[model samples]
Target: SLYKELVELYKRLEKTTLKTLKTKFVSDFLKSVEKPELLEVIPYLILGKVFPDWDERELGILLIKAVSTIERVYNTLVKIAEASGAGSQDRKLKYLANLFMDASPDEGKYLARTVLGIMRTGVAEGLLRDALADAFKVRVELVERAYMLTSDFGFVAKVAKLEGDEGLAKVKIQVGKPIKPMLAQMAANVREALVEMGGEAEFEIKYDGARVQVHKNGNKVLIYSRRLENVTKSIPEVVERVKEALKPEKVIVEGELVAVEETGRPRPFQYVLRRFRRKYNIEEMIEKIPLELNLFDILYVDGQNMIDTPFMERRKVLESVVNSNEWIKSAENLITKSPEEAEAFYHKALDLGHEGLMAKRLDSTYEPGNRGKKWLKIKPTMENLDLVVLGAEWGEGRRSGVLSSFLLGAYDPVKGDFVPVGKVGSGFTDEDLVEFTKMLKPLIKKEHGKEVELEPKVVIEVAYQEIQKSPKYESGFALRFPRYIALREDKGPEDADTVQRLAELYQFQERLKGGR
Candidate 1:
């Protein structure tokens, strides 16, 4: 069945590298699952990233809208893909998927048009489910990596994940870290344990460096990263240090080696990057250079598994194990009885040029990759918007300048694409648009295009009383009427509103419409 095959595809999608190959794989998968027509087209469109706003349910409706017949929908997807000539109806959906994926990408502003196509075009619900379910089978990090290695899914998962919203989090697992996962964090975040039996919170540091996993078998040290990529060859200096620091021949320690500046503070992120970048003079850099191996948690010591050991006890064991590795040091303590004290510590960390602090409930064990309120990071914040940038109009009247308008949108995680709510034509001064044009011009990629590949970098805060669904948007989603806020500087393109959110807002609007 296409469903089973799709699940299997999702699993492999977690691992496959190279875009062309995945495209071929997806194409072949489509060939076998069902017909080459619209039944197959919905999944292809989904592979295109959706507005981060929409989620699964709204996306399902959008898929339903993208096709009526397998053949016509498939052709529409092809048209969507070929931003070039008269899109000769190719009996393929991969190209279409690619176009959709990149259409509203940080580099593309074809978001509105690509979504419009899904509305005007149509596809089956079954195919949407098949594709979405398949996507849910793997973790997003793996999915993103797979797409990075091969652009195929990167283009599609943008939108498809919404349809594939599996009601479960995609597990973040390393290829070979032994599933006996342990939670991770920076030092100074651990709490002063109380009431909880045999438990103590271990504070770790925001080591301004790379996380190194040392698998020690006697004298040998095998190093891995946070992603489990092998870096044993890159940090021979660190390896030698690990060899010397460890007193046990059969112990494995997980810690971070932070690069510090001359001011005795941790180095910038790039300092860690140099360790991973490789191909540089590491031996020379190792001597004249500097780093701190802040050991937070221990994975293995002797032959016993430290992962299951209670938190408070493990700290004692880790401290006993830390020998002198010039840079290797014990985690600092900011143990406090109150959460308020923790908050003050957090601010002090920032004053000292640190990345703030992490707070852990003393009783809780480290829950790997899962964010629980048991732990929290009081850090920076970015004001995001679900507003969409409405269809851009030429600056006319007093200014026949470039195209600019309200960036209106809503939060739709379903279709994973922001349905255009409205446009903001007022925020830009001529000077700002002149500057904005220079910034936005390079994003233009289409042959005969009105919409530039407006990367999702700049977000404008659009004010709107309400939102509604209309034929205007492909997903049957839109804002009632919206005006521009200001262009948000810190948000990413993926931060826009989505189809599902728009639908919910639409539904909410219906409930208030005089009992209609």
Candidate 2:
């Protein structure tokens, strides 16, 4: 197929707002795949991806000479990905320029967007799932389940086209592939979470640490971050613990890896993140920042896929496989119908310097990637919002040379954009300012005076006194006295609190004021 064909499809998909029409458009396009090899790449290209989600090689693309085929374009992209070493940057740029040199006008436009990761064609994962279902005459549920297991739509699309529902059914949680972890919705407090979970519920301590998925096959263990990036080398002690403690020949479990002081209290989250982002002098870091792994849930054990099992049963499986030790232990949990017992546990978790409690329904099956009501997080307060950094201003005084006073925004899922809510300058330590500046410098899109526009990639949790009506921001709302809480490394911009959620929170605050 010509690259122009795909570009034309992108144009049509970009122009449509009706989701049904978008799905229909993609469904028709998917049905036109004649070559089996094209099936693997077409799903990714339609979503403006040059590679699969698990493959981390970023094509990190323009003249018109020869007509470009999709195969030629994809192969050239692979060449760009292969560039490395000292002169690799210039080599990558040259390769990208050559691709543009062969691209047509329409092809060049989408090609640039695809390479930059800014494809705004309204074709999200859900639409692609539905389109695959419609085009291949397969069940959407099967496709979704396969996607949840693999986290790769391109591979799932290929299986759906060739093998149909049978192949998807055979898709199981493998040892090395990182599946999406189950997420929780926020509850106002302990009582609310208990009530929502049918009064009698199981509550686990929600630790203030990075969430990791440990994949173990015999002695080989791989730890994946919340975003599914492999960090096996960063936390070698965790890998050793898994090897010594986990009894299963092949298993996958989810846990929190917290950095701890000598007294066993967890260090600040940023300290733990330093371990994750470190690439050299790992032995020194391991000694300086000791970590503890708290196993909470099991997804796969031996050859069994445990995601379809009930939460309680999965917990049992997790316990059976893990030999609790000083550095590795089961998550502290309590099961009760009494609200007072649940409240006490919540207080205990807070007393230990943990974030809060996670109340879960006993019979709930693990739903990967779904933040439904089956699991609820009960934090101390509901005033915290996870906002993305949209822009920032250069710091002054003691904080000079670093980006401080971040402009934060909430995700508008409907609009598929981040809408500014307010700016936060307080609650950051000097270390945080320096670290953030180092991180945000590369993401700077433009700069004017001391203010610089940034790519909305970093998510930070912020606390505020109140939510107020305001026309100064695009969201039509602003946070009063917004203070930085912590950088939410586990979450992405898409996972940030939504504008709709902010509005709901504002209304709830208003009701409390009126009642008082």
Candidate 3:
């Protein structure tokens, strides 16, 4: 009945785009799954997943349910995801063939689509969430709050169905569990940024690296990416460094993981990116590309949730708990009423190859997953960098019809090579995209999927915020926040900026930020 109900619900969803109807269909489906385990499996199944994407598990199951119930399918899929090593796929395939052989036409259709990740039921996660709230008679906002904190939509649904609002209230920030990190909005200049925060704010250096939350409880430490993905396994060095640097026994702190040169100078953003999603060679990567965690904020410490606390007080707590080490340091910050000081810091951050500066309100509490006026990012005027277009990629979503984003490279005189610096997918007009495609089309050397390799003869002026270090590219550096400026018709690849020149610019930038 559970499998039949789901199959019927899918067919109904395909026939209508009416959100209310789709929601009610799901609402009805949820009520039908009386078993507790069936309820837990619904959200994950609706989303076409059994767990988070970052979790290192895969269900190689082509399995379906005919004789088996929906709960049985869910259990088998969990086993397949947890299965590993030799003969795993063989066992999965054997069981899966039996499932396909037994599945009805409706069930088989969905089974194939679900396993292949093409869950096109005309219902989105938003609709499913609405249905969950409607079915359980809980506030949509409360459900959203619980889901945001836990990052588990299925758990929220289960709680709503069982213990109701009381259970939803129990979900809170836990150390080592990833939560959606706070975000920022860009301001044109320091004036606008200050104006947004009511004329005064705390400005901290926005390092050109991945945003991470480091959680420490006793001897255990975990680093989570901005998307709330666990990256602890990839950054063992960070764990060791935090173990030495952080004083608190149990706490959660946020920071940027900037790659650095041996002397403590910042490397490109791409280098820091290598540490994320890496399944192998972690130890080798640590030595090859060293990283420094630049801590700026704290959320939880010593049985307190500092997320509700004011920014200034949290900074005090963060500063007190951190014992500065070479690899772990407080984010460089300036509390100022002066726009001039903020402007100077912005330039200095760029000079040091950091992104820019984050201007935050002194009184605002941390608001997760919400961009607000409490935090403003200050960046200087967009300036152009004369770089070579290495390649281009096909766009997605709305721009899927056109060639979008360019692989840009900087000249390395030492190696006589044009090392990749970064790519730009923004700041291009429709007219520009058409012209760029036509222009670069003639210079194509080869094709690899959507990426078109260019001859590197055509030089272009690219705009970016800062230059960061990376060993990922042939040039050992990359540009932060690069955008298309214009085609550099005046210069060739011979006249392109050198890596040495970029290094000099960054060194001068650090001196400027060093302060009087």
Candidate 4:
């Protein structure tokens, strides 16, 4: 159970990419842990955290937080991540250092990597699960299901080591506790629905909004986002009005929270994201960007787990309780066997400023945390790029004195520097222009007349007409008529599309044009 033991195992894991060998090592390590708590804690530390990545909690601790004890290092990250405001980051770094001071040299090196969120030892949950199952002589599916349901591998390991199958089964649907969201696979157009759905499907409007889960029990209401973070406190308006919108006293409703204009047209997806995690000036934000919930499905109601309920029944359940109010309403849908009907529905949703259409199986069951073809999204051939922001140019004309245009870059693992590909000058609001200037101010490495060199800290999503071969940019390609789609705050510069990917897209586009 000692942290040093884990450090040694991880070092061995780094030496080889052989999965069987990795499994043997992890199996031996977990076999050594005697305490049930160690089973839970070791899983997290191996994956580089005390909590899941989907969790919104920011584990702010660093090297200094690593006090004389590994227990303190683990607990410090969890506790400090729960707290917010000024000096929290500073306090975390100090505490992290103490953790390292308590550690031996090898322990400190691995501990530092884990604390920084870059502990890449090639040993993932899949390998760990195999090791756990092989070590404890339990079913792999059992471990997988329990981990998927709870979204906590440590708990799965603990139960498998202690109580086995019965404990895994007990990991059922719980109110107030967040569940992983069901996701949709992308389709090029509604035409795919005919082939994929076998002629018939249920099509719903795919609103460009935040995915949320609302759990209401008597009076207490909790709202969780796609990342499974509880945002109930952030949206006081939801907590106040949700009780009246959904009729059931105890229920779990899954839907989209969209910000709409005065004319009832939905705002851009990026614009609405400002509502998330806004602890300060929430009342002002609510007045500025009002939210409308479009309920699509129900996961639980009145102590019954409705996940196994057929898709049609779940929709009916959602319809039974939800009354169309200014705050919440049933999602608009059409049940049809014709692809033409699905196509028409897609156009209608698009015309109304929505994203596209979601074609779903009529008899499918809600599978939490799964992204299956059971629910499919159909959107137009609008090409978008997730590019890193390398630098920016100051605005001109009416948009003067703000950062308006952006210099985009793509990653190159071989070269180890971001390669410039193109510049995007469109698709931003007056608010976005002002915000970009403030955001890139700190990341400014150097500046000249109209442009400022940046640290490549920000990633921006862009929509473009074509990927044309160009000799001007260092990346050997350019995006024609590019426009800003959104700011990808969820991703970092390292996660941006690579230069090789840009080349592949260009080739793919060329093939499409040549075939026609």
TM-score of each: 0.43, 0.80, 0.69, 0.71
Q: Cα deviation of 484 in candidate 4 (Å)?
A: 6.3
Worst 10 residues of 3 by lDDT: 59-68
Best by TM-score: 2
Worst 10 residues of 2 by lDDT: 59-68
Model 3, 199-301: lDDT tens per residue?
A: 7889998886777888899998877776455778788888889988999998889999888998777887667766675745876787888888999899888
Q: Rank the candidates by lDDT, best first.
A: 2, 4, 3, 1
For each candidate in the order shown, give its overall lDDT on alpha carbons: 0.46, 0.81, 0.74, 0.75
What is the model-wide C-alpha lDDT for candidate 3? Answer: 0.74
**Model number with the top lDDT:** 2
Give the alpha carbon lDDT tens digit for every residue of 1-516 in model 2: 778777778877877667778888888888878764466778888877778645646655322322237877788888778655665654455566666676677676687667766565657676788899999999999998898888778778888988999999888777778788787767777777777888788899988788888889978998888867677877888889888999888888999988899898988777778898785599799998999989889998888888889888888778888888999998988889888988889888899997889988899999987767888887767658888898999967765688988999776644444678899999999898988999888777769888987778799989999899898998889988998888877676546778878877787577556734
Residue 61, model 1, lDDT: 19
RMSD, each candidate, Å?
14.7, 5.0, 12.9, 7.1
**CA lDDT, candidate 2, residue 197:** 83
402, model 3: CA deviation in Å? Answer: 12
| Separate clash counts for every candidate | 58, 1, 4, 16
Better candidate number, 3 or 4, judged by TM-score: 4
Which regions in candidate 4 have their CA more than 4 angstroms from the true location? 14-27, 53-141, 163-170, 188-195, 339-341, 382-484, 490-516
Candidate 1: C-alpha lDDT: 0.46
Segments in model 1 whose C-alpha atoms lie over 4 Å from true places: 1-204, 287-289, 339-348, 380-516
